[PDB]
Amino acid sequence: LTESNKKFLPFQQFGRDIADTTDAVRDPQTLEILDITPCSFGGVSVITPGTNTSNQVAVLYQGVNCTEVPVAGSNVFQTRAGCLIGAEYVNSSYECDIPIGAGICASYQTQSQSIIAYTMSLGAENSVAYSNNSIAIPTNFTISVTTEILPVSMTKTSVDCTMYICGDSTEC
Amino acid sequence: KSFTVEKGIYQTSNFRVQPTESIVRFPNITNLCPFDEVFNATRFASVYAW
Amino acid sequence: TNSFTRGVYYPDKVFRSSVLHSTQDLFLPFFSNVTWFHAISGTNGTKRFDNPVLPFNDGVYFASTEKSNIIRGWIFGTTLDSKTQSLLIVNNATNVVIKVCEFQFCNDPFLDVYYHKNNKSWMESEFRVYSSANNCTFEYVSQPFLMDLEGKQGNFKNLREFVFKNIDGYFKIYSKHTPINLGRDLPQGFSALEPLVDLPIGINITRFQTLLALHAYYVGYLQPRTFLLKYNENGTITDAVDCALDPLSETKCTL
Amino acid sequence: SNLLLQYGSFCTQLKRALTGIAVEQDKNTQEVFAQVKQIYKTPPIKYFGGFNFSQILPDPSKPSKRSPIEDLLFNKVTLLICAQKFNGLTVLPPLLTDEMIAQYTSALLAGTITSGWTFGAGPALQIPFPMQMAYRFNGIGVTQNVLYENQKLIANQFNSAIGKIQDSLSSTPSALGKLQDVVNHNAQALNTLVKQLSSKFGAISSVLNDILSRLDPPEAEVQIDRLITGRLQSLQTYVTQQLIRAAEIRASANLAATKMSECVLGQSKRVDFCGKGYHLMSFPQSAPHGVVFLHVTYVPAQEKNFTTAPAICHDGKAHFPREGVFV
Amino acid sequence: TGRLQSLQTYVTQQLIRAAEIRASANLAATKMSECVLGQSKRVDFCGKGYHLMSFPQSAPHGVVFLHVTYVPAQEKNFTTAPAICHDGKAHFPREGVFV
Amino acid sequence: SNLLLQYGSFCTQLKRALTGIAVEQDKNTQEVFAQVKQIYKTPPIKYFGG
């Protein structure tokens, strides 16, 4: 329940909206208009660097204002994806290891080992020297060999509709 | 479904908060009787006149 | 004449803001003829009444424009006798009276002195069409609904519109009063009817008649139709369109 | 919830299939935009040989570092969103926010106009812009002397053409039809899924509380048996429609990756691939859930007919042109 | 009906998945007919950089390509000019850059 | 028909999908064939160099 500013006409009582959800009600005593909203929910996920290197994790709740409502660790942080607990928001920038959302990437890096979450960096910042008259001609090269993988065909399969569905029973 | 996991993110379950109490506000104010006023009158009557 | 846009009401008690909704309820179809129904009813000599019996074709839409109290009331019923239950509604000047009780037959207004308007204006002649019966039911006295806003120097006409319908026993009365300037029958504009009175009285109703005291009204029949209501701002019906009048309306309902 | 277990593991793939679609949309954005290794930037001065680039280069006056052309695109695409979060349906945010999407686009502009096309095949090498256009006329069949002898006229022809683009979008309401139908199909599919909850599918009522309360438990299970499968097939249809639609976008995402690879990082000789006519160069522009290209093409005009002969004999021996036609 | 629904689901999933593979199979057929049987001028089609040739290699349910590319390095800046004027008339390069 | 309307909107989905397929077929012919603005006409005499 929450306070409603929308003005009702005297005869009508409910406040239904697009689709079939009830959106507003009126008080049966003292006749006051109220507003409704579902209480929060969401999915949880676990960010881990693998059992090979460590065992600490940092879970995340999706779309929950943890500042507004307590969820119930190491730290708390607010992100447009949700609330992240178990990591601290370092101010520097590196490349991305584990994506979260809205340009936040986490990794298992030292400062003595901990899980940190930072802001994504698109690469090393570089500039070029444009000019009215400036050309740069290369003098040496490099013969490289890359690689590329491509699927071609899957595995052929076949089924027997009568045998699978009916286990050799003449009634089926 | 393993004892070894690789790095990355993995969705496991979902989070849901729970209700705390219940609120019932039936119609206003209320309907009521005046027979209780009889109790605060004053005198009664005869024995063949209950 | 033909009804233009009147005959729309709020179907339920639900507030919806700025939405387009579809409705299946009984309605007055758009662009349908209405009979004039003029009764002189001058109450002269023995009997001059122009009241026939109306078949009550799935509810009645009623419109009128009196000065103060010319149009008075209604009887609903089937046999119109004490044998069967009959609705009666009278708008007294103080408070309305509604009586479901069985009545033998309605009485008549007084066939008084011929000077009906010369010097006879004293409020009197409660001509008591209500009769006496034993098995008698509950009454629903409440505030009057025929309050008139004063029309001064002409060009003011409080048009009265009421829809009476019966669905699964329950009897619904919808009312509205439009104080608009009008010189033609059912003037242009759009007006949505509020729900006013509900009756939990389930009886068969196939006939009805009007009370005129004295000592002019339009009647239409509702049909099942599908409309597209539009709710705007604080749950106000700004417009409603038909789904079977013309192909353009069919495309409007489809999209 | 107990009745759902006897049907088995149907929704496990339904959560698994939508995960694969979700991780795919964060991959489609990758190769369309992140074709470069280092983020470049333009110098403070902006005199590109007499060509006006103010419409596509970022303007720092606004908070978001966007360009005036793509700013018009943002207002035109219009997205209710509140009711979708109220039935277990979620909308995950994209991995790349709109700020760095504009930064990839700004990086591709800076490498193109300064370094030419060589930054797509190695280290970026700077070159002045009037000679870069001399190396794109050379790849369509005309000679370098055309450009410098008409440098000022071509500059006005390019500058006036790019100003017509902004008014072209505003005048036509059916311009950005393709991007608009993407968000329209997603929202319309969601509303049809939510409105399926009001359907009863041949049961007593569409509210699970009323079936449990008004009727006894022993035949309540058979009533919710018909209710679950009606809701389940509605959920099954949504994923199958999403699976087909996701493959169609991937076909368009791969085509957009090719145009950025060929029409932007080089001059393409495929006829009517980059644009309508002989191709010169291109420009990428970001958009909500899509990309917008600005192809610059070449079109001849002002014809004049002549008389020709395929060879010349001078000293008893035929002669053939080295590169040209005898007119 | 529960078991027949399982085949209806399973066949639908395989039909969609087989359409994705054929899209990859057609791309592999194009790469073998352009990156192997010739030289392709398409940018970033036969690998990053300027392309030279390629070598197919077999694989279980797939194919592996070994693109041999060309990448410049060791850059050095210079001062240039669009043309050359010798005797009152401009001179334009036929294939090179006036450096 | 009193039962089909009671099942929801299982016709609108299968009527908006066949319409999308049908309008797509008329689109496909446009890019394949209508690649020219004007309609050219062949000359009457037909000696094209042997």
PDB file of C-alpha atoms in Angstrom, chain D residues 12-242:
ATOM      1  CA  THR D  12      14.341 -25.989 -17.571  1.00  0.00           C
ATOM      2  CA  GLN D  13      15.002 -25.566 -21.291  1.00  0.00           C
ATOM      3  CA  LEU D  14      12.614 -22.599 -21.292  1.00  0.00           C
ATOM      4  CA  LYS D  15      14.983 -20.902 -18.872  1.00  0.00           C
ATOM      5  CA  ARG D  16      17.943 -22.313 -20.815  1.00  0.00           C
ATOM      6  CA  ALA D  17      16.725 -21.220 -24.259  1.00  0.00           C
ATOM      7  CA  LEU D  18      16.033 -17.643 -23.166  1.00  0.00           C
ATOM      8  CA  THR D  19      19.495 -17.504 -21.591  1.00  0.00           C
ATOM      9  CA  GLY D  20      21.034 -18.388 -24.956  1.00  0.00           C
ATOM     10  CA  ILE D  21      19.044 -15.623 -26.641  1.00  0.00           C
ATOM     11  CA  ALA D  22      20.057 -13.148 -23.928  1.00  0.00           C
ATOM     12  CA  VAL D  23      23.775 -13.899 -24.220  1.00  0.00           C
ATOM     13  CA  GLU D  24      23.475 -13.701 -28.016  1.00  0.00           C
ATOM     14  CA  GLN D  25      22.256 -10.090 -27.975  1.00  0.00           C
ATOM     15  CA  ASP D  26      25.379  -9.119 -26.029  1.00  0.00           C
ATOM     16  CA  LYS D  27      27.418 -10.814 -28.777  1.00  0.00           C
ATOM     17  CA  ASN D  28      25.675  -9.228 -31.779  1.00  0.00           C
ATOM     18  CA  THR D  29      26.583  -5.759 -30.485  1.00  0.00           C
ATOM     19  CA  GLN D  30      30.246  -6.836 -30.166  1.00  0.00           C
ATOM     20  CA  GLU D  31      31.365  -7.487 -33.747  1.00  0.00           C
ATOM     21  CA  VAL D  32      29.143  -4.786 -35.258  1.00  0.00           C
ATOM     22  CA  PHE D  33      30.807  -2.028 -33.217  1.00  0.00           C
ATOM     23  CA  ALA D  34      34.008  -3.319 -31.592  1.00  0.00           C
ATOM     24  CA  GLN D  35      35.927  -3.797 -34.848  1.00  0.00           C
ATOM     25  CA  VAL D  36      38.857  -1.715 -33.553  1.00  0.00           C
ATOM     26  CA  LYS D  37      41.543  -2.252 -30.924  1.00  0.00           C
ATOM     27  CA  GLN D  38      42.288   1.300 -29.734  1.00  0.00           C
ATOM     28  CA  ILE D  39      39.987   4.280 -29.224  1.00  0.00           C
ATOM     29  CA  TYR D  40      41.028   7.194 -31.431  1.00  0.00           C
ATOM     30  CA  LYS D  41      40.049  10.854 -31.229  1.00  0.00           C
ATOM     31  CA  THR D  42      40.048  13.805 -33.612  1.00  0.00           C
ATOM     32  CA  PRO D  43      42.411  16.781 -33.161  1.00  0.00           C
ATOM     33  CA  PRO D  44      40.980  20.044 -31.728  1.00  0.00           C
ATOM     34  CA  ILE D  45      41.053  21.771 -35.112  1.00  0.00           C
ATOM     35  CA  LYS D  46      38.466  20.526 -37.607  1.00  0.00           C
ATOM     36  CA  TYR D  47      39.491  21.846 -41.035  1.00  0.00           C
ATOM     37  CA  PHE D  48      39.241  18.773 -43.273  1.00  0.00           C
ATOM     38  CA  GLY D  49      40.216  20.364 -46.571  1.00  0.00           C
ATOM     39  CA  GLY D  50      36.948  22.270 -46.879  1.00  0.00           C
ATOM     40  CA  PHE D  51      34.572  19.450 -45.887  1.00  0.00           C
ATOM     41  CA  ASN D  52      32.111  20.165 -43.067  1.00  0.00           C
ATOM     42  CA  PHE D  53      31.896  17.303 -40.556  1.00  0.00           C
ATOM     43  CA  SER D  54      29.953  19.024 -37.761  1.00  0.00           C
ATOM     44  CA  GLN D  55      26.789  16.955 -38.190  1.00  0.00           C
ATOM     45  CA  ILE D  56      28.352  13.539 -37.526  1.00  0.00           C
ATOM     46  CA  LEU D  57      31.216  14.397 -35.157  1.00  0.00           C
ATOM     47  CA  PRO D  58      30.302  14.560 -31.442  1.00  0.00           C
ATOM     48  CA  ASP D  59      29.223  17.859 -29.894  1.00  0.00           C
ATOM     49  CA  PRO D  60      30.484  18.315 -26.306  1.00  0.00           C
ATOM     50  CA  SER D  61      27.889  20.939 -25.294  1.00  0.00           C
ATOM     51  CA  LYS D  62      25.321  18.271 -24.429  1.00  0.00           C
ATOM     52  CA  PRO D  63      26.028  15.981 -21.432  1.00  0.00           C
ATOM     53  CA  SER D  64      25.976  12.839 -23.564  1.00  0.00           C
ATOM     54  CA  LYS D  65      28.775  12.990 -26.142  1.00  0.00           C
ATOM     55  CA  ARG D  66      26.512  12.467 -29.145  1.00  0.00           C
ATOM     56  CA  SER D  67      26.172  13.977 -32.612  1.00  0.00           C
ATOM     57  CA  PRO D  68      23.333  16.178 -33.939  1.00  0.00           C
ATOM     58  CA  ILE D  69      22.288  13.606 -36.561  1.00  0.00           C
ATOM     59  CA  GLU D  70      21.864  10.728 -34.110  1.00  0.00           C
ATOM     60  CA  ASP D  71      20.172  13.062 -31.612  1.00  0.00           C
ATOM     61  CA  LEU D  72      17.225  13.356 -34.001  1.00  0.00           C
ATOM     62  CA  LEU D  73      17.105   9.551 -34.221  1.00  0.00           C
ATOM     63  CA  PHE D  74      16.779   9.215 -30.440  1.00  0.00           C
ATOM     64  CA  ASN D  75      13.697  11.439 -30.198  1.00  0.00           C
ATOM     65  CA  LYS D  76      11.952   9.716 -33.113  1.00  0.00           C
ATOM     66  CA  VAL D  77      12.107   6.183 -31.692  1.00  0.00           C
ATOM     67  CA  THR D  78       9.554   5.996 -28.874  1.00  0.00           C
ATOM     68  CA  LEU D  79       9.034   3.151 -26.412  1.00  0.00           C
ATOM     69  CA  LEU D  80       3.428   0.051 -20.698  1.00  0.00           C
ATOM     70  CA  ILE D  81       6.874  -0.667 -19.251  1.00  0.00           C
ATOM     71  CA  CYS D  82       5.499  -0.540 -15.693  1.00  0.00           C
ATOM     72  CA  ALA D  83       3.075  -3.471 -15.950  1.00  0.00           C
ATOM     73  CA  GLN D  84       5.574  -5.910 -17.501  1.00  0.00           C
ATOM     74  CA  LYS D  85       7.602  -6.258 -14.284  1.00  0.00           C
ATOM     75  CA  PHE D  86       4.509  -7.351 -12.325  1.00  0.00           C
ATOM     76  CA  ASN D  87       4.088 -10.997 -13.397  1.00  0.00           C
ATOM     77  CA  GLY D  88       7.587 -12.444 -13.115  1.00  0.00           C
ATOM     78  CA  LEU D  89       8.638 -11.030 -16.486  1.00  0.00           C
ATOM     79  CA  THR D  90      12.000  -9.263 -16.359  1.00  0.00           C
ATOM     80  CA  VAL D  91      13.939  -7.017 -18.723  1.00  0.00           C
ATOM     81  CA  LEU D  92      17.696  -7.344 -18.338  1.00  0.00           C
ATOM     82  CA  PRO D  93      19.776  -4.282 -19.268  1.00  0.00           C
ATOM     83  CA  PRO D  94      22.337  -4.443 -22.085  1.00  0.00           C
ATOM     84  CA  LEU D  95      25.973  -5.048 -21.224  1.00  0.00           C
ATOM     85  CA  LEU D  96      27.159  -2.070 -23.296  1.00  0.00           C
ATOM     86  CA  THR D  97      25.401   1.105 -22.206  1.00  0.00           C
ATOM     87  CA  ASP D  98      24.568   3.826 -24.714  1.00  0.00           C
ATOM     88  CA  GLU D  99      27.538   6.007 -23.706  1.00  0.00           C
ATOM     89  CA  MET D 100      30.210   3.560 -24.871  1.00  0.00           C
ATOM     90  CA  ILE D 101      28.129   2.663 -27.940  1.00  0.00           C
ATOM     91  CA  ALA D 102      28.586   6.272 -29.030  1.00  0.00           C
ATOM     92  CA  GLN D 103      32.277   5.977 -28.130  1.00  0.00           C
ATOM     93  CA  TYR D 104      32.805   3.018 -30.476  1.00  0.00           C
ATOM     94  CA  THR D 105      31.010   5.002 -33.175  1.00  0.00           C
ATOM     95  CA  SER D 106      33.149   8.072 -32.461  1.00  0.00           C
ATOM     96  CA  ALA D 107      36.267   5.891 -32.651  1.00  0.00           C
ATOM     97  CA  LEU D 108      35.296   4.560 -36.084  1.00  0.00           C
ATOM     98  CA  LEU D 109      34.789   8.099 -37.394  1.00  0.00           C
ATOM     99  CA  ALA D 110      38.168   9.294 -36.107  1.00  0.00           C
ATOM    100  CA  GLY D 111      40.123   6.447 -37.685  1.00  0.00           C
ATOM    101  CA  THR D 112      38.290   6.805 -40.996  1.00  0.00           C
ATOM    102  CA  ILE D 113      38.696  10.533 -41.614  1.00  0.00           C
ATOM    103  CA  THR D 114      42.296  10.837 -40.403  1.00  0.00           C
ATOM    104  CA  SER D 115      43.965   7.487 -41.087  1.00  0.00           C
ATOM    105  CA  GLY D 116      42.013   6.606 -44.229  1.00  0.00           C
ATOM    106  CA  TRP D 117      41.334   2.877 -44.369  1.00  0.00           C
ATOM    107  CA  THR D 118      44.672   1.439 -43.241  1.00  0.00           C
ATOM    108  CA  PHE D 119      43.687   1.140 -39.571  1.00  0.00           C
ATOM    109  CA  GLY D 120      41.577  -1.912 -40.394  1.00  0.00           C
ATOM    110  CA  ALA D 121      44.642  -3.859 -41.563  1.00  0.00           C
ATOM    111  CA  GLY D 122      47.321  -2.863 -39.053  1.00  0.00           C
ATOM    112  CA  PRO D 123      48.625   0.249 -37.311  1.00  0.00           C
ATOM    113  CA  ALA D 124      46.855   3.484 -38.170  1.00  0.00           C
ATOM    114  CA  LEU D 125      48.766   5.710 -40.599  1.00  0.00           C
ATOM    115  CA  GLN D 126      47.739   9.344 -40.927  1.00  0.00           C
ATOM    116  CA  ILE D 127      47.046  10.962 -44.302  1.00  0.00           C
ATOM    117  CA  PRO D 128      45.408  14.300 -45.222  1.00  0.00           C
ATOM    118  CA  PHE D 129      41.789  14.045 -46.338  1.00  0.00           C
ATOM    119  CA  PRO D 130      42.003  15.606 -49.868  1.00  0.00           C
ATOM    120  CA  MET D 131      44.492  12.919 -50.885  1.00  0.00           C
ATOM    121  CA  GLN D 132      42.376  10.129 -49.389  1.00  0.00           C
ATOM    122  CA  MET D 133      39.523  11.039 -51.734  1.00  0.00           C
ATOM    123  CA  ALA D 134      42.095  10.994 -54.535  1.00  0.00           C
ATOM    124  CA  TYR D 135      42.706   7.324 -53.689  1.00  0.00           C
ATOM    125  CA  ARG D 136      38.999   6.449 -53.823  1.00  0.00           C
ATOM    126  CA  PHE D 137      38.387   8.073 -57.200  1.00  0.00           C
ATOM    127  CA  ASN D 138      41.319   5.945 -58.374  1.00  0.00           C
ATOM    128  CA  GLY D 139      39.386   2.782 -57.497  1.00  0.00           C
ATOM    129  CA  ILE D 140      36.226   3.465 -59.514  1.00  0.00           C
ATOM    130  CA  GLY D 141      37.856   4.164 -62.860  1.00  0.00           C
ATOM    131  CA  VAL D 142      38.590   7.902 -62.862  1.00  0.00           C
ATOM    132  CA  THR D 143      41.957   9.611 -62.566  1.00  0.00           C
ATOM    133  CA  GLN D 144      43.324  11.742 -59.706  1.00  0.00           C
ATOM    134  CA  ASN D 145      43.376  14.950 -61.767  1.00  0.00           C
ATOM    135  CA  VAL D 146      39.570  15.201 -61.603  1.00  0.00           C
ATOM    136  CA  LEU D 147      39.421  15.862 -57.852  1.00  0.00           C
ATOM    137  CA  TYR D 148      41.960  18.661 -57.344  1.00  0.00           C
ATOM    138  CA  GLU D 149      40.788  20.492 -60.461  1.00  0.00           C
ATOM    139  CA  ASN D 150      37.290  20.575 -58.912  1.00  0.00           C
ATOM    140  CA  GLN D 151      38.060  20.460 -55.180  1.00  0.00           C
ATOM    141  CA  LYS D 152      35.927  23.427 -54.103  1.00  0.00           C
ATOM    142  CA  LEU D 153      32.849  22.394 -56.103  1.00  0.00           C
ATOM    143  CA  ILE D 154      32.886  18.864 -54.657  1.00  0.00           C
ATOM    144  CA  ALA D 155      33.223  20.354 -51.159  1.00  0.00           C
ATOM    145  CA  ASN D 156      30.007  22.356 -51.549  1.00  0.00           C
ATOM    146  CA  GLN D 157      28.282  19.350 -53.127  1.00  0.00           C
ATOM    147  CA  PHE D 158      29.149  17.157 -50.135  1.00  0.00           C
ATOM    148  CA  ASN D 159      28.306  19.842 -47.566  1.00  0.00           C
ATOM    149  CA  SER D 160      24.854  20.594 -48.983  1.00  0.00           C
ATOM    150  CA  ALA D 161      24.032  16.892 -49.368  1.00  0.00           C
ATOM    151  CA  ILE D 162      24.675  16.090 -45.709  1.00  0.00           C
ATOM    152  CA  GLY D 163      22.343  18.891 -44.623  1.00  0.00           C
ATOM    153  CA  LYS D 164      19.471  17.387 -46.603  1.00  0.00           C
ATOM    154  CA  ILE D 165      19.700  14.159 -44.577  1.00  0.00           C
ATOM    155  CA  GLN D 166      18.527  15.752 -41.319  1.00  0.00           C
ATOM    156  CA  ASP D 167      15.415  17.269 -42.903  1.00  0.00           C
ATOM    157  CA  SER D 168      14.719  14.034 -44.800  1.00  0.00           C
ATOM    158  CA  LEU D 169      14.175  12.077 -41.580  1.00  0.00           C
ATOM    159  CA  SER D 170      11.910  14.723 -40.032  1.00  0.00           C
ATOM    160  CA  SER D 171       9.654  15.103 -43.079  1.00  0.00           C
ATOM    161  CA  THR D 172       9.015  11.403 -43.689  1.00  0.00           C
ATOM    162  CA  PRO D 173       7.168   9.668 -40.816  1.00  0.00           C
ATOM    163  CA  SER D 174       7.909   6.220 -42.310  1.00  0.00           C
ATOM    164  CA  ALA D 175      11.687   6.726 -42.285  1.00  0.00           C
ATOM    165  CA  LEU D 176      12.707   4.683 -39.226  1.00  0.00           C
ATOM    166  CA  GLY D 177      10.167   1.931 -39.806  1.00  0.00           C
ATOM    167  CA  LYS D 178      12.566  -0.974 -39.307  1.00  0.00           C
ATOM    168  CA  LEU D 179      13.785  -0.005 -35.832  1.00  0.00           C
ATOM    169  CA  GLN D 180      10.269   0.899 -34.681  1.00  0.00           C
ATOM    170  CA  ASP D 181       8.837  -2.512 -35.591  1.00  0.00           C
ATOM    171  CA  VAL D 182      11.516  -4.202 -33.463  1.00  0.00           C
ATOM    172  CA  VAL D 183      10.307  -2.642 -30.210  1.00  0.00           C
ATOM    173  CA  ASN D 184       6.678  -2.891 -31.328  1.00  0.00           C
ATOM    174  CA  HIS D 185       6.830  -6.660 -31.818  1.00  0.00           C
ATOM    175  CA  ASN D 186       8.460  -7.223 -28.422  1.00  0.00           C
ATOM    176  CA  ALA D 187       5.980  -5.112 -26.447  1.00  0.00           C
ATOM    177  CA  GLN D 188       2.967  -6.531 -28.294  1.00  0.00           C
ATOM    178  CA  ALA D 189       4.125 -10.099 -27.624  1.00  0.00           C
ATOM    179  CA  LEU D 190       4.503  -9.307 -23.913  1.00  0.00           C
ATOM    180  CA  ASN D 191       0.988  -7.871 -23.585  1.00  0.00           C
ATOM    181  CA  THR D 192      -0.508 -10.927 -25.284  1.00  0.00           C
ATOM    182  CA  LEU D 193       1.361 -13.095 -22.774  1.00  0.00           C
ATOM    183  CA  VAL D 194       0.104 -11.128 -19.759  1.00  0.00           C
ATOM    184  CA  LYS D 195      -3.497 -11.067 -21.021  1.00  0.00           C
ATOM    185  CA  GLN D 196      -3.434 -14.877 -21.228  1.00  0.00           C
ATOM    186  CA  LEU D 197      -3.743 -14.929 -17.424  1.00  0.00           C
ATOM    187  CA  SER D 198      -7.363 -13.748 -17.653  1.00  0.00           C
ATOM    188  CA  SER D 199      -8.318 -16.704 -19.858  1.00  0.00           C
ATOM    189  CA  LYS D 200      -9.855 -19.730 -18.164  1.00  0.00           C
ATOM    190  CA  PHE D 201      -9.069 -22.411 -20.811  1.00  0.00           C
ATOM    191  CA  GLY D 202     -12.265 -24.303 -20.037  1.00  0.00           C
ATOM    192  CA  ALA D 203     -12.079 -24.132 -16.235  1.00  0.00           C
ATOM    193  CA  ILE D 204     -14.335 -22.755 -13.507  1.00  0.00           C
ATOM    194  CA  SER D 205     -12.473 -19.465 -13.050  1.00  0.00           C
ATOM    195  CA  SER D 206      -9.216 -17.740 -13.959  1.00  0.00           C
ATOM    196  CA  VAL D 207      -8.234 -17.000 -10.334  1.00  0.00           C
ATOM    197  CA  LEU D 208      -6.422 -19.835  -8.567  1.00  0.00           C
ATOM    198  CA  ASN D 209      -7.678 -18.667  -5.161  1.00  0.00           C
ATOM    199  CA  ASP D 210     -11.340 -19.092  -6.129  1.00  0.00           C
ATOM    200  CA  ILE D 211     -10.818 -22.644  -7.413  1.00  0.00           C
ATOM    201  CA  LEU D 212      -9.121 -23.645  -4.157  1.00  0.00           C
ATOM    202  CA  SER D 213     -11.653 -21.863  -1.935  1.00  0.00           C
ATOM    203  CA  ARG D 214     -15.083 -22.316  -3.525  1.00  0.00           C
ATOM    204  CA  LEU D 215     -14.485 -25.956  -4.513  1.00  0.00           C
ATOM    205  CA  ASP D 216     -13.184 -28.870  -2.481  1.00  0.00           C
ATOM    206  CA  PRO D 217      -9.596 -30.186  -2.913  1.00  0.00           C
ATOM    207  CA  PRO D 218     -10.425 -33.681  -4.369  1.00  0.00           C
ATOM    208  CA  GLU D 219     -11.579 -32.301  -7.745  1.00  0.00           C
ATOM    209  CA  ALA D 220      -9.617 -29.049  -7.459  1.00  0.00           C
ATOM    210  CA  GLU D 221      -6.559 -30.768  -8.950  1.00  0.00           C
ATOM    211  CA  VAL D 222      -8.357 -31.732 -12.167  1.00  0.00           C
ATOM    212  CA  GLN D 223      -9.551 -28.128 -12.539  1.00  0.00           C
ATOM    213  CA  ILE D 224      -6.051 -26.682 -12.175  1.00  0.00           C
ATOM    214  CA  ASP D 225      -4.792 -29.499 -14.416  1.00  0.00           C
ATOM    215  CA  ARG D 226      -6.595 -27.877 -17.342  1.00  0.00           C
ATOM    216  CA  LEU D 227      -5.549 -24.411 -16.146  1.00  0.00           C
ATOM    217  CA  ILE D 228      -1.805 -25.130 -16.056  1.00  0.00           C
ATOM    218  CA  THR D 229      -1.547 -26.582 -19.576  1.00  0.00           C
ATOM    219  CA  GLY D 230      -3.457 -23.601 -20.940  1.00  0.00           C
ATOM    220  CA  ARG D 231      -0.913 -21.300 -19.318  1.00  0.00           C
ATOM    221  CA  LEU D 232       1.984 -23.589 -20.276  1.00  0.00           C
ATOM    222  CA  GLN D 233       1.206 -23.664 -24.004  1.00  0.00           C
ATOM    223  CA  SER D 234       0.980 -19.870 -23.956  1.00  0.00           C
ATOM    224  CA  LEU D 235       4.484 -19.788 -22.470  1.00  0.00           C
ATOM    225  CA  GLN D 236       5.725 -22.388 -24.967  1.00  0.00           C
ATOM    226  CA  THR D 237       4.463 -20.333 -27.916  1.00  0.00           C
ATOM    227  CA  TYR D 238       6.237 -17.188 -26.677  1.00  0.00           C
ATOM    228  CA  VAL D 239       9.650 -18.884 -26.622  1.00  0.00           C
ATOM    229  CA  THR D 240       9.161 -20.517 -30.040  1.00  0.00           C
ATOM    230  CA  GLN D 241       8.187 -17.166 -31.563  1.00  0.00           C
ATOM    231  CA  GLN D 242      11.201 -15.592 -29.851  1.00  0.00           C
TER     232      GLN D 242
END
